[PDB]
């Protein structure tokens with residue numbers, strides 16, 4: 001459970017993300033693919049991009065960045081009350097895309113990295129802890145829904 005204080009720290013940082021959603025989303029996916037290259041194998045649509053500069057130049061990767069942050073932003077704004085938002089995401093990521101929880105840990109690490117890179121003044125230890133707690137709650141709840149669908153990834 002996040003406190004009101006922790007949610008405010010999360011949603012203040014998120015408001016900065018929403019000022020350049022496409023830039024943040026693209027940088028998060030590129031960070032993911034750079035830090036954990038195996039993750040790129042899950043994306044038939046992007047696995048032809050070979051350099052960081054090619055990924056940065058990809059309008060289609062950037063649009064997927066917007067998808068991912070729009071979905072996560074809607075979940076974070078529910079402050080834990082996100083059953084309805086997780087349902088479709090759990091169904092696709094468990095049974096179609098087959099995304100293990102360790103890859104949701106990797107993308108969580110990429111989110112923390114990009115938000116600290118872009119907002120070092122306003123993303124110190126307490127805001128990082130609160131964002132980590134929010135992403136931990138997301139991963140815990142989606143893992144529970146994964147298992148309800150029979151997926152042990």
Ligand code: HEM
Pocket residue numbers: 039040042043044045064067068069071072088089092093097099103104107
């Ligand atoms: C914060 C975490 C994530 C959020 C909010 C998220 C959200 C989304 C959304 C909204 C879609 C489009 C609708 C859908 O199919 O459900 C999507 C598609 C997809 N996601 Fe995720 N995603 C997450 C993490 C990941 C990770 C870590 C991987 C792989 C390592 C992944 C791989 C997939 C793939 C393969 C698609 C289909 C992409 C395509 O259009 O070709 N996702 N994701």
